[PDB]
């Protein structure tokens, strides 16, 4: 089997993609945010607190044939950036571009936090990490890819994030058409549960490349690109009047400016990121200051590839019995 799904930006930004799920029986189509830094798939609901809910797509396990409430299970969970949501756990049919997994742990929500409530274009998350983190509980759940895999063709999908365009998320093969070059692939370390690897370097523009390791994970969930103190500071040095401001959050340049690129290595191979990409637009209504793509890691304690990185490239994540991360460039 295969699956083949557009992944569409919420924003003029790309600050999330949502990419449409079927789930129960009939279908209830939601917009979920695909997430490849966490293991829930979970959705606002029938059940989700009323004043907590604005403009969003709901399931309704009630109209669906196939719901079947897993007995005294529930969920809870943190995100890196503080928002949180919990509930309760169904079981449903959940197809993603004709891909159809039977039994799904369909994860519903009682309450979200203020910033789920306030964006009305994300109806939940579907996690592509691996199972090991999701949080049901007592008995932990598996995620879509985990149940899908033994079917599928090839044990694998892929992301093609777009630059402010839609792209997909393929299940079971890889698009051959989809890349330039080769797919260099690089080791992935499981034990913190997610597609964490270890980039060998990055360049500013045009400058040298510095070898160097970079451990991090590639988090479609995450809107930026979240990297050593060190290397953000030699970024933001090649931009005129760029800073970073507490006050803000993170480094800002002006909007006049032109951006350089920012490469990063994959083995032997580079992926560059254009500098358009690392422009995510005034800090507020109006101002001549913007906020970047490229920001630091401290404090976060671990580096983030995040779509700023990821949709420069074409990206296969290898869930063979040796989890691998292929990149190429497109």
């Given at each position: ?7 569409t ?11 449409p ?7 209830q189509?939601?917009?979920l945010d ?8 979970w ?9 907590e809910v604005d403009?969003?797509?709901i ?8 719901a ?24 449903d ?14 994860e ?9 409530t ?8 579907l996690?592509?990490?691996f199972?090991?983190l ?6 932990q759940?598996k995620?879509?890819?985990?149940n ?8 694998v ?16 093969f890889?698009?051959?058409?989809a ?11 499981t034990?913190?549960?997610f ?7 990055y ?11 970079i ?6 969930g ?5 990297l ?16 970073s ?6 480094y ?15 083995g032997?191979?580079?992926?560059v ?12 209504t ?11 890691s401290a ?5 983030i ?12 994540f ?13």
């Amino acid at each position: 089997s295969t699956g083949s799904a557009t992944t569409t930006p919420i924003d003029s930004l790309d600050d999330a993609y949502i990419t449409p799920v079927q789930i129960g029986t009939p279908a209830q189509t939601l917009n979920l945010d695909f997430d490849t830094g966490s293991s829930d798939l979970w959705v606002f609901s029938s059940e989700t607190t009323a004043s907590e809910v604005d403009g969003q797509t709901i399931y309704t396990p009630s109209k669906s044939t196939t719901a079947k409430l897993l007995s005294g299970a529930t969920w809870s969970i943190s995100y890196g950036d503080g928002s949180s949501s919990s509930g309760d756990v169904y079981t449903d049919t959940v197809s993603v571009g004709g891909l159809t997994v039977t039994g799904q742990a369909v994860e519903s929500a009682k309450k979200v936090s203020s910033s789920f409530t306030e964006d009305s274009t994300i109806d939940g998350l579907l996690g592509l990490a691996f199972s090991t983190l999701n949080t049901v509980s007592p008995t932990q759940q598996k995620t879509f890819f985990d149940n899908a895999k033994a079917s599928l063709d090839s044990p694998v999908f892929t992301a093609d994030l777009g630059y402010h365009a839609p792209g997909t998320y393929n299940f079971g093969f890889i698009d051959t058409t989809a890349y330039t070059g080769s797919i260099t692939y690089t080791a992935v370390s499981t034990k913190q549960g997610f597609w964490e690897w270890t980039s060998t370097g990055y360049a500013v523009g045009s400058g040298t490349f510095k070898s160097t390791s970079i451990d991090g994970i590639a988090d479609t969930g995450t809107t930026l690109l979240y990297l050593p103190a060190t290397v953000v500071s030699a970024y933001w040095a090649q931009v005129s009047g760029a800073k970073s401001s507490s006050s803000v959050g993170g480094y800002v340049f002006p909007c006049s400016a032109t951006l350089p690129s920012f490469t990063f290595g994959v083995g032997s191979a580079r992926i560059v990121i254009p500098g358009d990409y690392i422009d995510f637009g005034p800090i507020s209504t109006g101002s001549s200051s913007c906020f970047g793509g490229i920001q630091s890691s401290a404090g976060i304690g671990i580096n983030i590839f995040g779509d700023v990185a990821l949709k420069a490239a074409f990206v296969v994540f290898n869930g063979a019995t040796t989890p691998t991360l292929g990149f190429a460039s497109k």
